[PDB]
Amino acid sequence: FIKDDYGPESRGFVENSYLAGLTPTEFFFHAMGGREGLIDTAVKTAETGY
Amino acid sequence: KNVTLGVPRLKELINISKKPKTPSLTVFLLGQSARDAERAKDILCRLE
Amino acid sequence: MNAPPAFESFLLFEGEKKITINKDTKVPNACLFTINKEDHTLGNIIKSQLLKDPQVLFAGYKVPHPLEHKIIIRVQTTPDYSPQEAFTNAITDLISELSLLEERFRVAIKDKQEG
Amino acid sequence: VIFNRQPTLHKMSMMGHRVRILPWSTFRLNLSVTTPYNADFDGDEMNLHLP
DNA sequence: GGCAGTACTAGTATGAAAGTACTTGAGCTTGATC
RNA sequence: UAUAUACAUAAAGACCAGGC
DNA sequence: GATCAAGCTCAAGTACTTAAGCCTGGTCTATACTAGTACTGCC
Ligand SMILES: [Mg+2]
Incomplete structure (x- = not known):
């Protein structure tokens, strides 16, 4: 992407559905949004248990 | 207005920590300053 | 280590009766057959032959559990026709x-070969 | 038997059961019972304490 | 043939926590004395 | 003929990997 | 009436205690220094 692109594609909006398949970058951003799910689930359990 | 919720807010109430991440105070207005936005912004300037 | 023997499905050991007939107290003329070491091959034939008999009000089977091999067949017939006669x-x-x-x-x- | 799964978050995660003995190697339990223990069947394990 | 020195082996000796509570130091106020 | 061979030992700790 | 000293309170800095539950596997566990004993070489 070009510097200072605030458009929907550059900032992570994925316009494809799992069926048509994600394009390369949308695959990476989709992986960045899923890492935040894995991390929370690993962190919160040890706090909710203490 | 971003406030803390979920488990991070639960440690605050339980531990009764002196300094919460997000202290907040809701304020209600009595007279005509409640209905009018202009009369309200006046009190708004007095609290800030 | 707990896997049951393969032959345990179709073989009877000492003391197991093949068939066990128990009357059913809920209903008049109702009987309940219990067939050891059988499965849906045998149970389904009979049920579907009992429902052709117009003197049979109810017939059905079930395998209580798949890991133990037995069939349980309830039969209810009309009065003066015995549910053991229906099943024979x-x-x-x-x-x-x-x-x-x-x-x-x-x-x-024989028709098919050279004909 | 009493029957457990860790961690025990509330008290529905220890409930007394009534044994029935079946072949092969795994404890077997009704599917409605998988709501309290919060256990789905993929490689899970559950303790058994015989009073 | 015996004694001394050196080497080897065996055993013994030693960045990317956070928060709360307590203690110490400094500052301010009051009382006493000149 | 009688009588006898009855159970104990694999230490503990450290880090590492995985499971739910 | 003013100045100095003492006492009390407040704020800041430093130190001490905790960070999920159960379970299965594996690999690996001192080194260095000193003292004593044995063997070899030389007188
Ligand atoms: Mg699971």
């Missing part, structure tokens, strides 16, 4: 069907 006529009627099918399949073979 069912078995003799299949034998008279399957003996007719094995003879008709042998004729179609």
Whole structure:
């Protein structure tokens, strides 16, 4: 992407559905949004248990 | 207005920590300053 | 290490009766058959032969659990027709069907070869 | 038997059961019972304490 | 043939926590004395 | 003929990997 | 009436205690220094 692109594609909006398949970058951003799910689930359990 | 919720807010109430991440105070207005936005912004300037 | 023997499905050991007949107290003329070491092959034939008998009000089977091999067949007939008679006529009627099918399949073979 | 799964978050995660003995190697339990223990069947394990 | 020195082996000796509570130091106020 | 061979030992700790 | 000293309170800095539950596997566990004993070489 070009510097200072605030458009929907550059900032992570994925316009494809799992069926048509994600394009390369949308695959990476989709992986960045899923890492935040894995991390929370690993962190919160040890706090909710203490 | 971003406030803390979920488990991070639960440690605050339980531990009764002196300094919460997000202290907040809701304020209600009595007279005509409640209905009018202009009369309200006046009190708004007095609290800030 | 706990896997049951393969033969344990179709073989009876000492003391197990093949069939066990217990009357059913909920209902008049209702009987409940218990067949050890059988499965849906045998149970389904009979049920479907009992429902042709117009003097049979109810017939059905179930395998209580798949890991233990037995069938449980409830039969309810009309008065003055015994549910043990219903279940015997069912078995003799299949034998008279399957003996007719094995003879008709042998004729179609000889016809089929060189004919 | 009493029957457990860790961690025990509330008290529905220890409930007394009534044994029935079946072959092969795994404890077997009704599917409605998988709501309290919060256990789905993929490689899970559950303790058994015989009073 | 015996004694001394050196080497080897065996045993013994030693960045990317956070928060709360307590203690110490400094500053301010009051009292006493000149 | 009688009588006898009865159970104990694999330490503990450290880090590492995985499971739910 | 003013100045100095003492006492009390407040704020800041430093130190001490905790960070999920159960379970299965594996690999690996001192080194260095000193003292004593044995063997070899030389007188
Ligand atoms: Mg699971």
